[PDB]
Amino acid sequence: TKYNHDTKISSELQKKEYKKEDLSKINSDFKFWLSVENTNINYPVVQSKDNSYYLDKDFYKKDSISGTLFMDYRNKSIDDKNIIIYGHNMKNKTMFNNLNKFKDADFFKKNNKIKITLNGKEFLYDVFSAYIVLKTNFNNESDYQNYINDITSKSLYKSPIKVNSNDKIVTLATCRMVIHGRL
């Protein structure tokens, strides 16, 4: 079990989140907290002006190979139809490494929910698609529904949870494993 500077920073931020501290006063790019059931994915999510800055920057904007979970720069609100979050597949089983656990068919059949915590509110997304390999803007309902059929049939396993254009989707993509949840 490796203990390095990155696992210490992330473990300290999980404690501050548990102590209900305002993480925005540490990093103004902070948007919400993210966790996935039955995984060690329990990290803050930030957002920059692009989709590359936090690839090699930790929550304190220092150089880090683990980086920070960051949401796509194109997304604007929690009411967007597809919220995309990017994270690394670290060899020490951190960040988005536990997305690989959704390759297991028995684990996938278990309803592991994606949890977004924002302003004292919990948003639960039931995972319905997981596969190995991303649109944030949809012009109309047809483009969104086509996107739903696209990622549903891409799933390695049929999910008992079905999704239509009346749902909101969250996407956890590695920067490659990719999973999709629905609200």
Q: Note the resolution in Å, 1 decimal.
A: 2.6
- Active site annotation includes 170: no
Q: Are strands 113-118 and 82-87 parallel, antiparallel or unpaired?
A: unpaired
Q: State the catalytic residue, choosing from 9, 26, 175, 183.
A: 175
First to last CA, the chain: 36
- The answer to whether 178 and 122 are in contact (CB under 8 A) is no
Strand 169-174 with 82-87, pairing: parallel
HEC profile of the chain: CCCCHHHHHHHHHHHHHHCCCCHHHCCCCEEEEEEECCCCCEEEEECCCCCCHHHCECCCCCECCCCCCEECCCCCCCCCCEEEEEECECCCCCECHHHHHHHCHHHHHCCCEEEEEECCEEEEEEEEEEEECCCCCCCCHHHHHHHHHHHHHCCCCCCCCCCCCCCCEEEEEECCEEEEEEC
Contact 161, 128 (CB under 8 A): yes
Give the phi and the psi of residue 30 in degrees, each rounded to 5: -60, 135
In the set 31, 57, 81, 88, the catalytic residue is: 88
- 175 an active-site residue? yes
Domain 1-183 has CATH 1.10.1040.10: no
